[PDB]
Amino acid sequence: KIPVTGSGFVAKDDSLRTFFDAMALQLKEPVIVSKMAARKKITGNFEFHDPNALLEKLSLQLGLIWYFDGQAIYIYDASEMRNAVVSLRNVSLNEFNNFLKRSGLYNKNYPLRGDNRKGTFYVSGPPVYVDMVVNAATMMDKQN
Amino acid sequence: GSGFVAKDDSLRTFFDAMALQLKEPVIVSKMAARKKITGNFEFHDPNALLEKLSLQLGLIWYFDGQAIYIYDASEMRNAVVSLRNVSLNEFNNFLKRSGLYNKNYPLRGDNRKGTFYVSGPPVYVDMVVNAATMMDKQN
């Protein structure tokens, strides 16, 4: 009834939402693709046996940014990367950068650029990583 | 080897195909996406090809460590900022140790004074101004 002998996913003009929904079982987390990155299409025979490297290579050939915060995988396209300059009051950068390593929100692709003992630093990434870092740093300095 | 064959591509399809040889994603602007290019190109020295092509086409670009922003030449903007109690040496060593120092668009000014003049892409000018007026309120 379904004759193909191997193991893989055949896409015929799939719109990048039903494609990344198929990777949501090999990856053990649900994937959320944005509205602008759901206008592109893809076709072909794919094979998922190591998806954390397959997603990295497809994100560079297509032009996409992604993020994994432990419970889901957010996927945007490249034209939604946003910037922010936030100046800390009384907490250092190395202290804030150690809070992210202890929690689990540290991403080595988009690190925090700034002086090691200062208040001002520069962040640039996906709109959920920027909106998390900017909001948590001001509620840590107003707390201290 | 490898390569790319462009037949009437519009500088977003073209520069997206170079975003694997370059290891960073490329964000081409909107007004700089109306120019077109064809031809048989081979991607093996991508950093020298970007510098040779960005002067022949007419473009400005800036790499902030995580992405490559690309504009066209009619979008360069200026800024003249003045620091209260921070010298230019203290700000210019901050951009040096942080990894945001760009030699193509440096800072024009006296070595230890307050005022200087910066000009570049709109994502670099808005970073230098906003991180310069926020060290004055800090100190």
Binding site: I42 | S2, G3
Partner: peptide
Amino acid sequence: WLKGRSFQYGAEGYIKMSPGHWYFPSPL
């Protein structure tokens, strides 16, 4: 072959049927 199509040849190939369309056949 691939008349008005832009492609990226050599060992990891994809043909672009449209500005928003990718196709992954045999390495072109």
